[PDB]
Amino acid sequence: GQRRIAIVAKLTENAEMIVSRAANRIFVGGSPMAYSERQKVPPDFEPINIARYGPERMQKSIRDLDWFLRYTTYAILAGDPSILEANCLGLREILEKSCSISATIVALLEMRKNAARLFKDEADSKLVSSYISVVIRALDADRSDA
Amino acid sequence: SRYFKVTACIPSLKRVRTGRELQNTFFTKLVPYENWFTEQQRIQKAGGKVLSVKLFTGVQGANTGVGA
Amino acid sequence: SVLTKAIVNADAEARYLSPGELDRIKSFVASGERRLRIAQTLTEARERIVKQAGDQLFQIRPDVVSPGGNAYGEKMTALCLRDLDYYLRLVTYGIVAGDVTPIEEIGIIGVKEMYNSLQTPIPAVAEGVRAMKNVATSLLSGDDAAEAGFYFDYLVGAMQ
Amino acid sequence: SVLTKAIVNADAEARYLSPGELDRIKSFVASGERRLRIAQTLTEARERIVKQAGDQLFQIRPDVVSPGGNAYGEKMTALCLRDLDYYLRLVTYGIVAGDVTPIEEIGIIGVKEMYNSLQTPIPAVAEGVRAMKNVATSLLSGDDAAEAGFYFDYLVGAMQ
Amino acid sequence: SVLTKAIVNADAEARYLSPGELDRIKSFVASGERRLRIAQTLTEARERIVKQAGDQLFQIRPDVVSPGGNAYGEKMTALCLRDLDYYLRLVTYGIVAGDVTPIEEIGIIGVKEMYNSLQTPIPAVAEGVRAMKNVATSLLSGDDAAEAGFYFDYLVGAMQ
Amino acid sequence: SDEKERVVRAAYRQVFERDLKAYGQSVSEAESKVKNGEISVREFVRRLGKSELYRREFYQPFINSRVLELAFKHFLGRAPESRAEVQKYFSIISSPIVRGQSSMPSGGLYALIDALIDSEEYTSIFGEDTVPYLRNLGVEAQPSW
Amino acid sequence: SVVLTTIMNADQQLRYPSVGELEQIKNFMEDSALRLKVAKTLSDANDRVVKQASAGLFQRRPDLNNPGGNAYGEKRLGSCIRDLGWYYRLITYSIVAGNNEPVERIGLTGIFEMYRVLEVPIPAMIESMRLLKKEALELLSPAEAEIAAPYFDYVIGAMQ
Amino acid sequence: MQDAITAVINNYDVQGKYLDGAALDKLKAYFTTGAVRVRAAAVISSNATTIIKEAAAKALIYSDLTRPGGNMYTTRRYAACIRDMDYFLRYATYAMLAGDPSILDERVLNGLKETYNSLGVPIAATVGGIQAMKEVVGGLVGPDAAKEASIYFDYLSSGLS
Amino acid sequence: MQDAITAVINNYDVQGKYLDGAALDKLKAYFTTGAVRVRAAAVISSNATTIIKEAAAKALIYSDLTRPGGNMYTTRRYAACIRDMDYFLRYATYAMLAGDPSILDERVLNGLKETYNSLGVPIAATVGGIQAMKEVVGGLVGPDAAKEASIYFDYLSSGLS
Amino acid sequence: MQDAITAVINNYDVQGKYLDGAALDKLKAYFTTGAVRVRAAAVISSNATTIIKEAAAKALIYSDLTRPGGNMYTTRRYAACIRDMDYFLRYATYAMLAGDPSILDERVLNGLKETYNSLGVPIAATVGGIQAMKEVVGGLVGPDAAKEASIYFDYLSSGLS
Amino acid sequence: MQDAITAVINNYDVQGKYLDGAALDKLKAYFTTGAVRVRAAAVISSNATTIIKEAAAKALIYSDLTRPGGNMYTTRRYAACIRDMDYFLRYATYAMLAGDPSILDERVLNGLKETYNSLGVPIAATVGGIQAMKEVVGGLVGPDAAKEASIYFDYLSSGLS
Numbered sequence A: 001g002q003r004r005i006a007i008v009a010k011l012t013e014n015a016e017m018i019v020s021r022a023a024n025r026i027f028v029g030g031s032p033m034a035y036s037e038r039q040k041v042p043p044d045f046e047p048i049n050i051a052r053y054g055p056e057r058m059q060k061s062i063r064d065l066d067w068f069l070r071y072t073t074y075a076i077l078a079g080d081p082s083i084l085e086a087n088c089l090g091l092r093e094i095l096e097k098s099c100s101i102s103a104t105i106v107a108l109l110e111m112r113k114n115a116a117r118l119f120k121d122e123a124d125s126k127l128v129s130s131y132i133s134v135v136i137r138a139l140d141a142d143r144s145d146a
Numbered sequence B: 001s002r003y004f005k006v007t008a009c010i011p012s013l014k015r016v017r018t019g020r021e022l023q024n025t026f027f028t029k030l031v032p033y034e035n036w037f038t039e040q041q042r043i044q045k046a047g048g049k050v051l052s053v054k055l056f057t058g059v060q061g062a063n064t065g066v067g068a
Numbered sequence C, D, E: 001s002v003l004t005k006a007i008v009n010a011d012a013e014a015r016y017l018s019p020g021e022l023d024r025i026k027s028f029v030a031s032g033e034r035r036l037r038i039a040q041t042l043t044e045a046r047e048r049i050v051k052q053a054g055d056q057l058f059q060i061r062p063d064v065v066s067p068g069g070n071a072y073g074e075k076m077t078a079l080c081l082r083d084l085d086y087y088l089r090l091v092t093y094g095i096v097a098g099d100v101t102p103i104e105e106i107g108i109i110g111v112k113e114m115y116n117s118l119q120t121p122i123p124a125v126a127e128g129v130r131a132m133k134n135v136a137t138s139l140l141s142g143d144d145a146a147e148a149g150f151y152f153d154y155l156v157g158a159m160q
Numbered sequence F: 001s002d003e004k005e006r007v008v009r010a011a012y013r014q015v016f017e018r019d020l021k022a023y024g025q026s027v028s029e030a031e032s033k034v035k036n037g038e039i040s041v042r043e044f045v046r047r048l049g050k051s052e053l054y055r056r057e058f059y060q061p062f063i064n065s066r067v068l069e070l071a072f073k074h075f076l077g078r079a080p081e082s083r084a085e086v087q088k089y090f091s092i093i094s095s096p097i098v099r100g101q102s103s104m105p106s107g108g109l110y111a112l113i114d115a116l117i118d119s120e121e122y123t124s125i126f127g128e129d130t131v132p133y134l135r136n137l138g139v140e141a142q143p144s145w
Numbered sequence G: 001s002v003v004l005t006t007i008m009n010a011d012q013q014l015r016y017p018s019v020g021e022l023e024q025i026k027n028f029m030e031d032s033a034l035r036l037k038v039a040k041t042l043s044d045a046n047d048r049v050v051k052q053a054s055a056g057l058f059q060r061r062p063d064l065n066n067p068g069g070n071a072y073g074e075k076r077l078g079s080c081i082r083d084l085g086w087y088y089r090l091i092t093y094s095i096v097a098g099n100n101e102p103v104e105r106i107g108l109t110g111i112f113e114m115y116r117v118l119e120v121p122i123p124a125m126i127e128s129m130r131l132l133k134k135e136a137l138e139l140l141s142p143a144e145a146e147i148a149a150p151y152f153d154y155v156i157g158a159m160q
Numbered sequence H, I, J, K: 001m002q003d004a005i006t007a008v009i010n011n012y013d014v015q016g017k018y019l020d021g022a023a024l025d026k027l028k029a030y031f032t033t034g035a036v037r038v039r040a041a042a043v044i045s046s047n048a049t050t051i052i053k054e055a056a057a058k059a060l061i062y063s064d065l066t067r068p069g070g071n072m073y074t075t076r077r078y079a080a081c082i083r084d085m086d087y088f089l090r091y092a093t094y095a096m097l098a099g100d101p102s103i104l105d106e107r108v109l110n111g112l113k114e115t116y117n118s119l120g121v122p123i124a125a126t127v128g129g130i131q132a133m134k135e136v137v138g139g140l141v142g143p144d145a146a147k148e149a150s151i152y153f154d155y156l157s158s159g160l161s
């Protein structure tokens, strides 16, 4: 109930910072959140914001992180991570032609850890950590998925 | 009217079903005479084997009492 | 028989026998003596009916007793008369039974497959049964004629 | 009825009627005027039978007309007598029909659920039906008495 | 009980235990202490509750203690009190078990055939259970009495 | 305990489209053995299909060509998908005797229900233990024709 | 095999082989004399084609032999090369067979399920089988290439 | 199932001769039974539940079976036993009307002892209940066919025990 | 089917929005009333047969419906009417638990008016029975959940009528 | 099940050896003769009913088996035995086409011997009918496929006995 | 489903005529165009998945279908594509192997508009996706076999719209 409402409200109030830390960590060569339209493992082989990817890839890159954060709040209000895992079950096959999967998994890890930073770990810090861990767990393998 | 009491195992070798496939891989069930042939052919078609057949219900004389 | 059919129906319904079901038994047991008399008459005249049925069959369907036709030889004709006697015995069984399930479980199920394997003319066998029915009507009374003709027409319809 | 039952079975098996079924139809049509006379007698004695069955039921189970009784009160007893008349009418319908298809479709399927809904004693209603059976067999000859009463015990067994 | 139904539903769904499905498990393990306390508070007065429900049932239904009733006689009255104690044991079983499954599997499936073969008033038994509920609710606290009355009314609806 | 009743009441709902316990009817004879260990759920469903209760309810009021479409939804959880399928099942229903192997208790509804239950599709999806269920949009790939 | 596939359909439909089916069964054998040396040439390259395919696929996808790769290390490379040899052997078994049977029945029905707990990239296996198909025809003539290309197309058409 | 007429028909049909005077007399026996069986069956069907109640009262009720620690204890098991008792009565009436006990071995006795051994049903209590059952039913229908009913009841008891 | 939470989440997903303050306040309103609905549903489940009991006694029986020629005449029609009335009660309970009429629209209301028109069932009598159980449920549940229960019964009655 | 090619393939796959000279020799030995198998199968399919006719005439019919008392009494048992005869002939043709008795070992002999024992079927009469079919088939097909059909006919007869 | 061979026979059978010169010309034309069809079928296979990906990139993706609200907004809606497609391939590869519309009208394009209307699924978008695959298969297959594949794809698109 009201705990879940407060948890999702706390994510929504500063969702920008959570995406910002992950984007700045995995994207080097500029400011990733200048490309966000809201303003309007060997982990990283850091893509350059203009050289390797380009603007059209950059917009998808910035959008999908905020989309992931939004669906986490969706499942948080929901009872289970079904909305998450049904949407990240076969996602890497779509992504991997233009995806650094190892780059994205470390971004998800940073997102989970930063979201845990916000809360006091009553049950809230473990809840968001468990929900975001579902995305990474269902994403990695490339063969247990789909 | 008579039901054969048999036991058999039938493995599925083309689909690898993933839920409660233990009650469907070995069974004993009374099957009528009129349906026993078509039921027994299914086990052989699937690839399993029948372990035993027992007439159970009736007599081997047949003649009257066969119909049902 | 009627008892077997009624008991089977009530057993399938999971209940004791219905008011039609009991009265069908009382009427059958009331008719039993005349059933036995008709059976006694047919059994006593069993050879004459078979002979006249064979005569009428071979006079109405000569193609069977022609070259080919599965009834050319003397042994083949004897076998055909034996089959007519078998169906007469089945009719006598059914009359005393009161229903036709004993006939169906013995000589009516698979008859098409067997006669197609042998290539015997099933319409010819039906004609023989019709001749047997005519002989029985000639050698019986009226009400007994109707009662036996019910089973004879059942055999004719089953061979169809 | 017997006709509906035989025709339904023949249609379900996709075949013409059997000789045994035809014989049962002949017996049923033969017993028709006797069945009609029995039904006419019961219809003419419908009110005395209901009243005597009421007295017998109240004597055997006066508790039902007690304060903790389903039929406590003159209006509840009138409803009990009305149900009694309903079941007598159903018995006459079954008598003329020769079977229990109309009785079943009208007054037993769901009767347990309805009487549980109304909190009424099913064994008490069966006792009333048996009292009806006694009063009705008191006004009929022996074969006719057995004929009506055996429908009555069909109703009693169904309410069980 | 609760665990059995949850695991059965999950296995029928062909998946692990749902996160929501484990929530009922956590709630049960949380409320187990309170339900055990309520269970002992009910068990400490088994004969007293049976007594007071006895006065309520006998005063509400002189039918049962009537000459036509089944409680006429100290022996069968004692049998009725033993049945009431049986049902109190069943409901305390259900209270400790968290699901009504033990109650369903001990005393409501076939209870109708039970009391019909014994010729006993199902509404009278339901009235006794309701009086037992009233005495128990007086004997417990309101919040836990809500769940206890839920179990008791499930039993009342089951015997009806 | 309490699971055999759950399975049996689901069987009635799937076969007759609703529970018959509300009315008070039941196939008591075949009901016991499926609980009881002799015949499987497949045999129990076949006895339910060829029982008198199903014949009076889904064979009397309808045409044969409608009885096929209702039996497809009852014993297979789907609709007939091709014209050739309808010809096969109608020719199975319509004839007095079809026979399979040996015996001939195969008339109308009895022959059709045997053909439906012994089909390759039935004993690949609802084989031998499972009460048949609706294979609607959520469950399987839905045909569009 | 083609005979196995035809007999499967014939036994499934409960009938003999068809008039258009024997025309295909005979045409499957008449080209067997030519096809025997076709797989024989591929048979006598078995430890060479896959060895040269290793450098062709691992150079293309360089993440299969890196620290974050599934085939990192000598013994991990050996497993991938052994898988390539296995699939080459199976495809030769199928080309000396006819229909998809040897590959589909043994090492094709459930590769997704095997890799489900094994973590080996299906899109990488697609390029591996593409490379194998490309490096095995050049040993053959274009006349044999026409009798070889579809037999290699099935692996990369199935895993997709 | 084979009734008396069907049994005689089969008996002379496997041998392969027309029915004779012996068969006529054997069928005449069942024909001269004269519906006393159907009257007795009608009476038993009329008062079936009363027979079950009295037999249970003089078999198992007010005893260890109906107290804790019994196969009869609890409503589900009692309902199963009473349904089985109704099964015994109905199939006994069926065999009594048919004239032949083949139905009892067909579906009323075949594997019944094995199922009871698997379950835990006391055979002796059921047998004694059936023993009281033939007495009550014979008291009901009358002495004309009481022996005829008792022979099928004894056949069922011998098969069960 | 859908409920309050699922409806809100899908309504914001279709736009592509984060769950804002208004959505969290609607979930505020749904969650604060939760236990009342649960206890009301428990009371309804425990007293289901008696709610139908008084509803039938006050709206249907003792009228021309149960006499011959009425729709609810005969045991079959009586059992069918009570089963329908129970269907309505149970689905109203589901709608009250979910906080949404989508389940009622999806699995009850469609085909219902057309089926009743086909079979001749009196829709006015059905609406009267639904109002009867609405009154009975309001009496049983009490002030806490009376309105929340009654709104879905009123929805069902308005959809039928 | 398996034929010559599939048997060679999986018999080599069990130890993971590529097709060698002996394997290709076995495959060539199969392919060099299967055309005669095709002709024999076509002739058998065209003359199936006559083969079952003459086998029954010279081995089963005109005997006490078809006389009253034998297993071949009644048209039902006659049709059942002739259907079994047809099944044996068709599976023998399948085995001859495939060049491997795995089809007979799986879809013919599996669950047949003990079934015949439980049904009372005469195994000696069945074997005699099988040899009658083999004689007729050898007469029809000619020297080209006579031994090829006869080997699998003997396989079926030896499996039965 | 019909091919050219079956279509000519069916057309010449309802009017009861033997195959004349015109029928033999149509069958001859199909037999002469019987190798490019087989080759282009294999070319469409293998490169099927890349064809679908390129067609999706060319028509579907980079539009409103991917933004919030579209019918391919999330995955599983994206996943219903590639599926949905792989049909329109698969089929019409069947068409340009047994060349006749027939199959495309009986299995794929029949009630598809009704299903799409009941499920959302922009028909104009799914027709643009079809034309994209038409272009990609015309590019991959070759100069002469680009046609008749263009024919079947155009038939599919026109029938859908």
Ligand SMILES: *[C@H](C)[C@H]1/C(=C/c2[nH]c(/C=C3N=C(/C=C4\NC(=O)C(CC)=C4C)C(C)=C\3CCC(=O)O)c(CCC(=O)O)c2C)NC(=O)[C@@H]1C
Pocket (backbone or CB within 6 Å): B010, B011, B012, B013, B016, B017, B020, B021, B022, B023, B025
């Ligand atoms: C795995 C560690 C080992 C192994 C196993 C293996 N199993 C099968 C086939 C079946 N396994 C089951 C299992 C179950 N049925 C149930 O009901 C349950 C519990 C609910 C279980 C665990 C069954 C019934 C089958 C047969 C049907 C089927 O194939 O699905 C196989 C396949 C055998 C075959 O090819 O026929 C295998 C290989 N194999 C190993 O090497 C391990 C030691």
Ligand SMILES: *[C@H](C)[C@H]1/C(=C/c2[nH]c(/C=C3N=C(/C=C4\NC(=O)C(CC)=C4C)C(C)=C\3CCC(=O)O)c(CCC(=O)O)c2C)NC(=O)[C@@H]1C
Pocket (backbone or CB within 6 Å): C057, C064, C069, C070, C071, C076, C077, C079, C080, C081, C083, C084, C086, C087, C090, C106, C107, C118, C120, C121, C122, C124, C125, C128, J061, J062, J063, J066, J067, J072, J073, J074, J075, J078
């Ligand atoms: C005579 C009117 C017709 C006719 C008959 C005919 N029958 C046979 C051979 C057989 N007939 C039977 C019959 C039965 N077996 C049973 O179990 C029953 C049911 C009681 C019957 C009726 C059998 C078994 C045979 C086979 C031989 C045997 O009995 O051992 C023949 C001989 C065919 C042949 O090829 O030899 C004939 C000619 N033929 C006619 O033309 C009439 C229409």
Ligand SMILES: *[C@H](C)[C@H]1/C(=C/c2[nH]c(/C=C3N=C(/C=C4\NC(=O)C(CC)=C4C)C(C)=C\3CCC(=O)O)c(CCC(=O)O)c2C)NC(=O)[C@@H]1C
Pocket (backbone or CB within 6 Å): D064, D065, D069, D070, D071, D072, D076, D077, D079, D080, D081, D083, D084, D086, D087, D106, D107, D118, D120, D121, D124, D125, D128, I061, I062, I063, I066, I067, I072, I073, I074, I075, I078
């Ligand atoms: C009388 C011997 C027993 C008894 C009966 C009793 N019945 C009611 C009320 C009703 N009974 C019916 C019955 C039927 N409806 C049908 O369609 C049929 C089939 C023909 C029957 C038998 C109905 C519909 C009612 C409801 C009222 C109405 O008819 O409109 C009551 C009243 C219950 C109450 O007021 O709560 C009673 C008492 N009571 C006994 O004690 C006898 C054993």
Ligand SMILES: *[C@H](C)[C@H]1/C(=C/c2[nH]c(/C=C3N=C(/C=C4\NC(=O)C(CC)=C4C)C(C)=C\3CCC(=O)O)c(CCC(=O)O)c2C)NC(=O)[C@@H]1C
Pocket (backbone or CB within 6 Å): E064, E065, E069, E070, E071, E076, E077, E079, E080, E081, E083, E084, E086, E087, E106, E107, E118, E120, E121, E122, E124, E125, E128, H061, H062, H063, H066, H067, H072, H073, H074, H075
């Ligand atoms: C009491 C409120 C009502 C009542 C009851 C009554 N019961 C009997 C006899 C028996 N009751 C039972 C009950 C059960 N067996 C079980 O397994 C369970 C579940 C736990 C129950 C409740 C049994 C077995 C008997 C038979 C005797 C025995 O226990 O051995 C009687 C006596 C009937 C008689 O004919 O003697 C009575 C009177 N009577 C009322 O008036 C109340 C409504």
Ligand SMILES: *[C@H](C)[C@H]1/C(=C/c2[nH]c(/C=C3N=C(/C=C4\NC(=O)C(CC)=C4C)C(C)=C\3CCC(=O)O)c(CCC(=O)O)c2C)NC(=O)[C@@H]1C
Pocket (backbone or CB within 6 Å): F029, F032, F033, F035, F036, F037, H065, H070, H071, H072, H076, H077, H078, H080, H081, H082, H084, H085, H087, H107, H108, H112, H115, H119, H120, H121, H122, H125, H126, H129
């Ligand atoms: C009664 C006098 C004694 C008794 C019986 C008892 N039986 C069961 C359970 C079963 N009984 C059956 C029986 C049959 N099913 C059939 O179809 C047939 C043939 C007509 C028979 C005989 C079976 C299979 C069951 C299991 C399923 C069921 O309950 O219906 C029980 C209950 C056992 C349990 O709880 O599982 C009982 C009590 N027990 C006694 O002590 C009496 C002396």
Ligand SMILES: *[C@H](C)[C@H]1/C(=C/c2[nH]c(/C=C3N=C(/C=C4\NC(=O)C(CC)=C4C)C(C)=C\3CCC(=O)O)c(CCC(=O)O)c2C)NC(=O)[C@@H]1C
Pocket (backbone or CB within 6 Å): F018, I060, I065, I071, I072, I076, I077, I078, I080, I081, I082, I084, I085, I087, I107, I108, I112, I115, I119, I121, I122, I125, I126, I129
């Ligand atoms: C009762 C208060 C009123 C009444 C009702 C009545 N209904 C039927 C028959 C049916 N009712 C239903 C209903 C449903 N099926 C569902 O799945 C749902 C929603 C989940 C509902 C509401 C159906 C399908 C039927 C037809 C099949 C069946 O009978 O089960 C009847 C019987 C009509 C007849 O005799 O043919 C009746 C009488 N009748 C009244 O008078 C009341 C106002």
Ligand SMILES: *[C@H](C)[C@H]1/C(=C/c2[nH]c(/C=C3N=C(/C=C4\NC(=O)C(CC)=C4C)C(C)=C\3CCC(=O)O)c(CCC(=O)O)c2C)NC(=O)[C@@H]1C
Pocket (backbone or CB within 6 Å): B033, B034, B036, B037, B040, B041, B062, F101, F102, F103, J065, J071, J072, J077, J078, J080, J081, J082, J084, J085, J087, J088, J107, J108, J109, J111, J112, J115, J119, J121, J122, J123, J125, J126, J129
């Ligand atoms: C015929 C030459 C002999 C003969 C046979 C006979 N068979 C049966 C009954 C059955 N036969 C089978 C056979 C098979 N099942 C299989 O899977 C296969 C191979 C694929 C075979 C051959 C089966 C299953 C049955 C029982 C089911 C059924 O028949 O539908 C009978 C009937 C026995 C009876 O009356 O109970 C007979 C007579 N009889 C002879 O006289 C010949 C020696």
Ligand SMILES: *[C@H](C)[C@H]1/C(=C/c2[nH]c(/C=C3N=C(/C=C4\NC(=O)C(CC)=C4C)C(C)=C\3CCC(=O)O)c(CCC(=O)O)c2C)NC(=O)[C@@H]1C
Pocket (backbone or CB within 6 Å): F137, F141, F142, F143, F144, F145, K060, K065, K070, K071, K072, K073, K076, K077, K078, K080, K081, K082, K084, K085, K087, K107, K108, K109, K112, K115, K119, K121, K122, K123, K125, K126, K129
């Ligand atoms: C993709 C380019 C477009 C699109 C499609 C879309 N389709 C569905 C769901 C279904 N599509 C089908 C299609 C078929 N079934 C058939 O049998 C055939 C021919 C053989 C076809 C073409 C069906 C039946 C379904 C429903 C069942 C299923 O999914 O298999 C969806 C899913 C809709 C939903 O979420 O419920 C989608 C999204 N979407 C786009 O944006 C493109 C324009």
Ligand SMILES: CCC1=C(C)/C(=C/C2=NC(=C\c3[nH]c(/C=C4\NC(=O)[C@H](C)[C@H]4CC)c(C)c3CCC(=O)O)/C(CCC(=O)O)=C2C)NC1=O
Pocket (backbone or CB within 6 Å): A057, A060, A061, A062, A064, A065, A067, A068, A071, A087, A088, A091, A094, A095, A097, A098, A099, A100, A103, A104, K061, K062, K066, K073, K074, K075, K078
């Ligand atoms: C809420 C869960 C969810 C997601 C995330 C999702 C993603 C998603 N990403 C897509 C594309 C894409 N996504 C990306 C890129 C990226 N993707 C990332 O998650 C990274 C941040 C980044 C790489 C670093 C690119 C480049 C494409 C275009 C397709 C291509 O790569 O060829 C597409 C195909 C349609 C399109 O082009 O928009 C989907 C459906 N759908 C879902 O249901």
